[PDB]
Design a binder for this molecule. Structure first.
Ligand SMILES: COc1ccccc1CN1C[C@@H](C(N)=O)CC1=O
Ligand SMILES: [Zn+2]
Length: 139
């Protein structure tokens, strides 16, 4: 689990969105595994606006943060789960690291701010849904 709070928005994994997230929907993209809902309280996370390929992510199944090198956002094949059939997920970045389903929502950060959130895993890889292109999150 985990979310990003920036301005009047909450960014979550689309497959983990709650009833309140869907009742306050701003934008959702199934191909990205992202959903953004509106909030009443002001968030103060900072979104990175950069092309970093190194950062640190939080892994709840190890209660640890790990430094990683990650690929640029791209269209990657993701195996079927209970939430989606096998498909290409867009705007996904991979790194070598540990990730279990409950790790979704953990933040990946670089020196500039929040880069994305854990969205995939298995086979010793971890995948993060990028949010750096969503420039409207700041206005
Ligand atoms: C071994 O499976 C995982 C490991 C870590 C994280 C997630 C999974 C399996 N996923 C992938 C998600 C997606 N983005 O399509 C939905 C889901 O349940
Ligand atoms: Zn950066």
């Amino acid at each position: 689990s985990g979310a990003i709070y920036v301005g009047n928005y909450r960014v979550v994994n689309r497959h983990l969105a709650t009833h309140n997230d869907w009742a306050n929907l701003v934008w959702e993209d199934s191909s990205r595994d992202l959903l953004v809902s509106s909030t009443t309280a002001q968030g103060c996370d900072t979104i990175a606006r950069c092309d970093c390929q190194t950062g640190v992510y939080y892994c709840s199944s190890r209660r640890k943060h790990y430094p990683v090198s990650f690929s640029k956002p791209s269209l990657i094949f993701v195996e079927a789960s209970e939430y989606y059939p096998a498909r290409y997920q867009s705007h996904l970045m991979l790194a070598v690291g540990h990730s279990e389903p409950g790790d979704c929502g953990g933040i990946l950060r670089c020196q500039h701010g929040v880069v994305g959130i854990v969205s995939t895993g298995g086979n010793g890889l971890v995948g993060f849904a990028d949010v750096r292109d969503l420039l409207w999150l700041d206005e």
